[PDB]
């Protein structure tokens, strides 16, 4: 039944396995340094995290 | 841009309903009318199930799902 279907051929590159930790959005993800935010949420929270504009 | 236009096959479907009769006629019977009766199913020699696991009957490869056991003479 359930085990006859699940976990048969590995999906090693799941885009749908990742989401923004603030709004749970699929797109515009920033996985660098482990932010795991979408780019809009990062722009909203960039100053609080510690990233600030200099150049 | 159009619609998916998924209409050319099966416009309407009816739900399948298994007519599982409430009376013990097809599944089991006694054919004795006495306190002691004969069982119409072969004894299961496997120890991987319980002591009251009784197998159903098909044309072959009696299907229970838990074991998928088939009588073979090797």
């Amino acid at each position: 039944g359930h085990q006859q279907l699940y976990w048969s051929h590995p999906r090693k590159f799941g885009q749908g396995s990742r989401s923004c930790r603030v709004c749970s959005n699929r797109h515009g993800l920033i996985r660098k340094y482990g932010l795991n935010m979408c780019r809009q949420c990062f722009r909203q929270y960039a100053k609080d995290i510690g990233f600030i504009k200099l150049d | 841009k159009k619609r998916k236009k998924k209409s050319y096959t099966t416009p309407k479907k009816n739900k399948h309903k298994r007519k599982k009769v409430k009376l013990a006629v097809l599944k089991y019977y006694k054919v004795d009318e006495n306190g002691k009766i004969s069982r119409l199913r072969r004894e299961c020699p496997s120890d991987e199930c319980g002591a009251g696991v009784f197998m159903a009957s098909h044309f072959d490869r009696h299907y229970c799902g838990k074991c998928c056991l088939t009588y073979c003479f090797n």
Binding site: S19, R21, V22, C23, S24 | -
Partner: protein
């Protein structure tokens, strides 16, 4: 939805024993960060929690991929009227006051 009654009573003693909880919305995924290894399937526990907090009589607030709950006394009254468990057995949460 699609929830059995044994899992219902399981999630109900969970609500009785915890009271104040935090959680995250997870359904499909088979292992859980902080509410797994509960001897009960993850999906049915989380769907029963969905029934608890979305049936229409206890409010919620969904943000930052996490859940924080205020469990009103209307829900407690509903529980006491249904399961007939008096509040005389106070939750152990009233320690370290």
């Amino acid at each position: 939805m699609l929830m059995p009654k044994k899992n219902r009573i399981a999630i109900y003693e969970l609500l009785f024993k915890e009271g104040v909880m935090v959680a995250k919305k997870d359904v499909h995924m088979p292992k859980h960060p902080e509410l797994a290894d509960k001897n009960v399937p993850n999906l049915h526990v989380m769907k029963a929690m969905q029934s608890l907090k979305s049936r229409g009589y206890v409010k919620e607030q969904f943000a930052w991929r996490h859940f924080y709950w205020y469990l009103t006394n209307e829900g407690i009254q509903y529980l006491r009227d249904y399961l007939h468990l008096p509040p005389e057995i106070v939750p152990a949460t009233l320690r370290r006051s």
